[PDB]
Amino acid sequence: QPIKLARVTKVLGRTGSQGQCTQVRVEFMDDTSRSIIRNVKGPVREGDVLTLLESEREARRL
């Protein structure tokens, strides 16, 4: 599947077992309106880019 860019728009909350994954609201650079929720490792900032291997799957919001 083509690799697609999701842009962090608003960092929401921290998740995982040991508080290790930042759960972030992403706004797609490809489609104008589609905004999904993704679990992300490492430190992430409000207003930067992610390279998603799939642009359809969504993580369970808490």
Partner: protein, 101 residues
């Protein structure tokens, strides 16, 4: 000592209400004593929906739901954490917990 006013049950002016089998055990609890719960669930959980949204023959077939009404005895309800113990003041609060999202 008297703990509840309505003796842990929603019977007031009957005398007898027919019993029900608990859905975890097969314990006989009266119909109104039991902790009832109505689970409306999608057949396919969370991610399976996307795979069956693409591998479907049809055009926007709103895949069906699963309606299951569950009666728990008080022990099964507390053990499964469907209910919990409460403060002497908070016990009287009958307004069910908010389900905003």
């Amino acid at each position: 000592t008297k703990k509840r006013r309505n003796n842990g049950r929603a019977k007031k002016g009957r005398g007898h209400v027919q019993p029900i089998r608990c859905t975890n055990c097969a314990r006989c609890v009266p119909k109104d004593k039991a902790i009832k719960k109505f689970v409306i669930r999608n057949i396919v959980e969370a991610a399976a929906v996307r795979d069956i949204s693409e591998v479907s023959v049809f055009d926007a077939y709103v895949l069906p739901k699963l309606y299951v009404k569950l009666h728990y005895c008080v022990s099964c309800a507390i053990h499964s954490k469907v209910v919990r113990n409460r403060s002497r003041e908070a016990r009287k609060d009958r307004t069910p917990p908010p389900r905003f999202r």
